[PDB]
Amino acid sequence: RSVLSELDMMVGKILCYLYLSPERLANQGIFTSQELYEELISLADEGKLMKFVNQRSSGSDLDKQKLQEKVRTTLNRLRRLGMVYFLPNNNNKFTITEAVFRFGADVRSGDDPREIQLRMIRDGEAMPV
Amino acid sequence: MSEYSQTVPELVSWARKNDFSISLPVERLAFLMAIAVLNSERLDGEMSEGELIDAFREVCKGFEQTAESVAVRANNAINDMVRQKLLNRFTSELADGNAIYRLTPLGISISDYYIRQREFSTLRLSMQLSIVANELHRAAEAAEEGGDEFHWHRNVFAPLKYSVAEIFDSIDMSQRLMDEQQNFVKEDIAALLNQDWQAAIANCEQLLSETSGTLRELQDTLEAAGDKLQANLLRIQDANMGSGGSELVDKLVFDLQSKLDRIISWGQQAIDLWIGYDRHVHKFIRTAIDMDKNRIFSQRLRQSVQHYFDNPWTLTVA
Amino acid sequence: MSEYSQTVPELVSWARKNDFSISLPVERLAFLMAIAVLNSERLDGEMSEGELIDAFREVCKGFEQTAESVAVRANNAINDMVRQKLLNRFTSELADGNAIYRLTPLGISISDYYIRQREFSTLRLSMQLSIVANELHRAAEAAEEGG
DNA sequence: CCGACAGGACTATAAAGATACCAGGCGTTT
DNA sequence: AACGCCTGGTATCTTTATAGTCCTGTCGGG
């Protein structure tokens, strides 16, 4: 048994919100890496998240491209897990599947987050770090 | 002569040869600020060695430091400031050997950046444009009246170099101040959206509208004056070309025209950047508010992503 | 309101709490000056990240330094200047993620102290005194007009 | 009070080692 | 070949120790 990385979780929870979003349902499920990246930076703390790419990052473009390449890497790993399918001829675009909802296991019930987390670790669903 | 007579490689060699450097630790920087403040409260703009030592003692108290060798520590700090070109020391035989101290332009510029609460003002800009318009108009009338090298140097070159150029630099500094203000507002809007995005919508719209109106008011003011300032610079250029020229006046007028173009261009660019952000924040708010309709998971999942690092957790896989 | 609203002890407490400091060794100071020179030669007063990296490379050459990690060292230097409030960075979605840089009033004041050959001109003073005399005279006429 | 003598504290620098951060190499997968 | 992962190297920073430098204190002598 193995565990996913925190960057994988960030991309996972964002892919989940993307699946739900009726605003983008008109795309018929086809999303682009750039749109995913734009949504992620819109919600999470950009400069604090950059700490995981490099301990010295302060918003430099080289570091921003390095983040984008790490996202490209993790997304490819999620594709192997069956959580996302790339288009047959274009690798810059892909389609989501319902399997992404496992990233919402900590909030699907409107209750105390601590108790939920305890329940999950007891069930073997998730580990801390 | 370009204000910076040296090319980048020449400057780098010159800097390397002269070994110029700045090192401002918290305690020394606090002492500098304390000196700057004490100097501003005085009638003669001069400080004695004992007064500087008393100021250092207060900083050391404020840092809760040992009272041992404070007189030595203060002398070291004073010598370091003098050695770093922050303080000028005057040793007069007439003063029975007592040294008089004054802050250097550098020591002042550094202390003012931290202590002076600098915020952008249109009234100020309007006044500055009015003065420069009158100075350029007088210089253009003097250039059109014609004259000798003494007339051109005193009534055209001196006002352009020692008055117009300085006012343009002040305008540019004010613009750079406004640039910092915009970055500060972006950080506040992100904080408001992270605390309570539902109650923060009205506050964010107020901050966006107040900043936008300011940027537009600024640009309207620059554009109204910019045409008159350029026309006067052109009148001076035409009069200079007609009176056999002066390479010194032509170069100075060209430099001022280049600065004026930069000053006018900056406002439009700042507005475009602010518009991109404003559209993005409005789109984000509309997406957050209106697209969840049972409105059940928007809050439920967004708060989880926003605060993940307070309880990072990971899934298990075969 | 005194330009400096804070007493010496209050300022010391405030400075201590905000942890303010400035570190510009000869290389960093030279780079700042190079950026200041390059900005003055431009029509838009803006510098891209690639142009700043090219400027850093010239400084490094001028200091006879190894060409190893120069893109990294340049990024660390650029981030240090932004972190030290010497440069303002603009990240626009419209610019496809390319950041635009401008020097802050502080970064300009420091660079100008070293690069600008400031010598005392009597004409300059006479001119400045002329402008202030006219500004004070207008302000006095406005104050006497009442309102 | 001076002057001598040592001792200690403080400060600064050197030396060494670690830690970060990237690159390069290698291995796998598209 | 490119991307992803690991290993080690290079840069940077910190820590640790040492040695300096000056100060302070004491005592004795003048």
Numbering used by the authors:
A (entry chain Q): 85 to 213
B (entry chain D): 1 to 318
C (entry chain C): 1 to 147
From the paper:
Focused sub-classification of the particle images revealed a DNA-bound structure. The DNA was captured directly at the open gate, while the proteins adopted a conformation virtually identical to the open-gate state. DNA-binding surfaces were largely contributed by MukE and MukF, and to a lesser extent by the root of the ν-MukB neck. MukE employed a DNA-binding mode overall similar to its role in DNA clamping; however, the DNA followed a differently bent path along its surface. We propose that the DNA-bound structure obtained here represents this capture state. The capture state, however, requires ATP binding only but not hydrolysis and can thus occur before DNA entrapment. While ATP binding exposes the DNA capture site, ATP hydrolysis triggers closing of the neck gate and ingestion of the captured DNA.
The heads are bridged by the kleisin MukF, whereby the C-terminal winged-helix domain (cWHD) of MukF binds the ‘‘cap’’ surface of one MukB, and the N-terminal middle domain (MD) binds the coiled-coil ‘‘neck’’ of the other MukB.
